[PDB]
């Protein structure tokens, strides 16, 4: 209600897009122990960077395709590794989030066409789903690859991005409903 929900909608859109991009890039997802350092590390999404051992603060990229005695021949495992490496589902969530924010901003321009906002809501919901999928594939890949491990602040930022995206979808749909109600 109160007609100001567009503000919260776009603020949430920009905030969640920022959180998602920050999480995709900062390389702080997994606090664990690796033989590369073995020692402590703060691996992320694209590149691993140790914090312990002879070389501290040294960052190197991770292969995602080690010699597993033809284990990469398995169709399911190969597909999972490919998706994890490309990491296209979180990217897709960010893209959909950005497009939804763009549609919401345009709504202030083309107020005649309501379908813009419905598209925005659908985009945000789909972004939430894609973020879920990215999280699932990331975790399943890590498991597939009994030590101690823990998740970094960037992962919780991704979770916040998902929650925000779904809330925004709700608000956009409510906006569209009210507008149609008052537009007969």
């Amino acid at each position: 209600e109160k007609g100001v929900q567009v503000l919260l909608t776009t603020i949430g859109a920009f905030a969640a897009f920022g959180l998602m991009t920050i999480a995709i890039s900062t390389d702080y997802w997994l606090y664990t122990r690796a033989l590369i350092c073995g020692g402590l590390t703060h691996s992320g999404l694209w590149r691993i960077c140790c914090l312990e051992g002879l070389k501290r603060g040294v960052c190197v990229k991770i292969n995602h395709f080690p010699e597993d005695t033809d284990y990469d021949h398995d169709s399911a495992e190969y597909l999972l590794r490919v998706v994890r490496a490309s990491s296209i589902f979180p990217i897709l969530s960010a893209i959909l989030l950005l497009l939804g924010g763009v549609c919401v901003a345009a709504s202030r321009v083309y107020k005649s066409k309501r379908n813009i906002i419905l598209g925005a809501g659908i985009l945000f919901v789909a972004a939430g789903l894609s973020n879920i999928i990215g999280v699932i594939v990331y975790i399943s890949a890590n498991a597939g690859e009994k030590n101690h491990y823990s998740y970094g602040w960037s992962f919780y930022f991704g979770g916040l991005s998902f929650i925000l995206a779904e809330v925004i979808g709700v608000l956009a749909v409510n906006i569209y409903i009210e507008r149609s109600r008052e537009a007969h």
Binding site: I122, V125, A126, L129, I132, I133, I136, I139, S140, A143, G144
Partner: protein
């Protein structure tokens, strides 16, 4: 249970949600005409 063991049903759930939204959009466009 790790998440690797029970991921398939999550994939199925997400596919179902996508399918539902697609179907609803299809019905929406159809009843628009």
């Amino acid at each position: 249970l790790s998440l690797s063991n029970v991921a398939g049903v999550f994939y199925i759930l997400v596919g179902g949600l996508g399918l539902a939204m697609l179907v609803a959009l299809i019905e929406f466009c159809y009843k628009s005409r």
